[PDB]
Amino acid sequence: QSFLWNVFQRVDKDRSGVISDTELQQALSNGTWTPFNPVTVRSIISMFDRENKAGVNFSEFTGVWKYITDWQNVFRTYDRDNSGMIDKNELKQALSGFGYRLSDQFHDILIRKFDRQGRGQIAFDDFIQGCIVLQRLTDIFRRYDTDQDGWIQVSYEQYLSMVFS
Amino acid sequence: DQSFLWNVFQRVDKDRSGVISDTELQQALSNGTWTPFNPVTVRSIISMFDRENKAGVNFSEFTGVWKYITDWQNVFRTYDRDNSGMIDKNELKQALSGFGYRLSDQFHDILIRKFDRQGRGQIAFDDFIQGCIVLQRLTDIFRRYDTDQDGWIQVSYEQYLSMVF
Ligand SMILES: [Zn+2]
Ligand SMILES: [Zn+2]
Ligand SMILES: [Zn+2]
Ligand SMILES: [Zn+2]
Ligand SMILES: [Zn+2]
Ligand SMILES: [Zn+2]
Ligand SMILES: [Zn+2]
Ligand SMILES: [Zn+2]
Ligand SMILES: [Zn+2]
């Protein structure tokens, strides 16, 4: 959770510590041998910005790495077989483990717009992303489910307002 | 014409694999902002004319792309009246109304806000495509649900998320 500062300056390839989506685009550990993911980097980068600083700065040279460890192990303790690869069943109890209770028809039809797989099964690339796609959209949904029944009823205007959040 | 497009195809197809990669098409495409054409859209426009699940395009399918890419360019120009090379809020209002959309005023803000990858007060060409695409899909889905044709739908959790593309 706390890793001093050390190299709070030379974090970027150039002088200043103004690292972001465009700069830390290809710096993380992926699982497909292609560059990790622009949209995945961005929702990680948008986790600690005191005043939209675009990177790490006073006492904020700490939280960027901590979110990786809390998910590096989380990918390991749920892979089950330990291969960096998630089967169909290896995600069923992986998601539901951190408090979800999705049914079976969800882990099936997803591999096109947000994903990038070519062999059916999802790797570490879309794992980190796929969850943030999921967790954020639950929090939206919940706010409108004032009844608390898992059944919202929006009109068209609202239906739009919401998927374009 | 037919002979024209065969040369263009030979030109864009760099490796000459016989298939346009989603990178090679990306390179072919401009939107006049010195930023690389939105890959998310290059991805869309391939998974839209590709028949062989090969995530690419042959001459036979390219003929369709080029006609796609063109019909949009005209729409884009038609509506960019202030000739900025981009579509401001009000030009979008005129543009979408043109496809017989019936949307509010605030919503065009939400859409632009969401799709202006550049952060420019307006939307460029490559993101106008995605923005109109995603709006089309969403509206269809909404319509498929609205059985009694109210303008309201009623959906469950997951049902909600499973409508995200
Ligand atoms: Zn596995
Ligand atoms: Zn409800
Ligand atoms: Zn209710
Ligand atoms: Zn090629
Ligand atoms: Zn003009
Ligand atoms: Zn304009
Ligand atoms: Zn304008
Ligand atoms: Zn209805
Ligand atoms: Zn009704």
From Swiss-Prot, chain A:
Subunit structure: Homodimer and heterodimer; heterodimerizes (via the EF-hand 5) with PEF1. Isoform 1 and isoform 2 self-associate; probably forming homodimers. Interacts with CPNE4 (via VWFA domain). Interacts with PDCD6IP; the interaction is calcium-dependent. Interacts with RBM22. Interacts with PLSCR4. Interacts with ANXA7 and TSG101. Interacts with DAPK1. Interacts with SEC31A; the interaction is calcium-dependent and promotes monoubiquitination of SEC31A. Interacts with ANXA11 (via N-terminus); the interaction is calcium-dependent.
An example molecular function term from Gene Ontology annotations: protein dimerization activity
Locations listed in the record: Endoplasmic reticulum membrane; Cytoplasmic vesicle, COPII-coated vesicle membrane; Cytoplasm; Nucleus
Superkingdom of this protein's organism: Eukaryota
Membrane found in the keyword field: yes
Resulting phenotype, W65A: Does not affect interaction with SEC31A. Does not affect interaction with PDCD6IP
GO cellular component: COPII vesicle coat; Cul3-RING ubiquitin ligase complex; cytoplasm; cytoplasmic vesicle; cytosol; endoplasmic reticulum; endoplasmic reticulum exit site; endoplasmic reticulum membrane
Binding annotation for Ca(2+) 2: D79, D81, S83, M85, E90
Consequence of changing F36A: Abolishes the interaction with SEC31A, PDCD6IP, ANXA7 and ANXA11
Domain EF-hand: from-to ranges: 1-34, 35-65, 66-101, 102-137, 138-165
Consequence when changing G99C: In a breast cancer sample; somatic mutation
Effect of I68A: Does not affect interaction with SEC31A. Does not affect interaction with PDCD6IP
Domain statement: Interacts with different set of proteins thanks to 3 different hydrophobic pockets. Hydrophobic pockets 1 and 2, which mediate interaction with PDCD6IP, are largely formed by residues from EF-hand 3 (EF3) to 5 (EF5), as well as by Tyr-156 (EF5) of a dimerizing molecule (Pocket 1) and from EF-hand (EF2) to 4 (EF4) (Pocket 2). Hydrophobic pocket 3, which mediates interaction with SEC31A, is mainly formed by residues from EF-hand 1 (EF1) to 3 (EF3).
Effect caused by changing F98A: Increases interaction with PDCD6IP and ANXA7. Impairs interaction with ANXA11. Augments stauroporine-induced cell death
Disulfide bond annotation, renumbered to this chain: none
InterPro entries: EF-hand-dom_pair, EF_Hand_1_Ca_BS, EF_hand_dom, Peflin/Sorcin_CaBP
Protein known as: Programmed cell death protein 6
Outcome of mutating W33A: Does not affect interaction with SEC31A. Reduces the interaction with HEBP2, PDCD6IP and ANXA7
Job description of the protein: Calcium sensor that plays a key role in processes such as endoplasmic reticulum (ER)-Golgi vesicular transport, endosomal biogenesis or membrane repair. Acts as an adapter that bridges unrelated proteins or stabilizes weak protein-protein complexes in response to calcium: calcium-binding triggers exposure of apolar surface, promoting interaction with different sets of proteins thanks to 3 different hydrophobic pockets, leading to translocation to membranes.
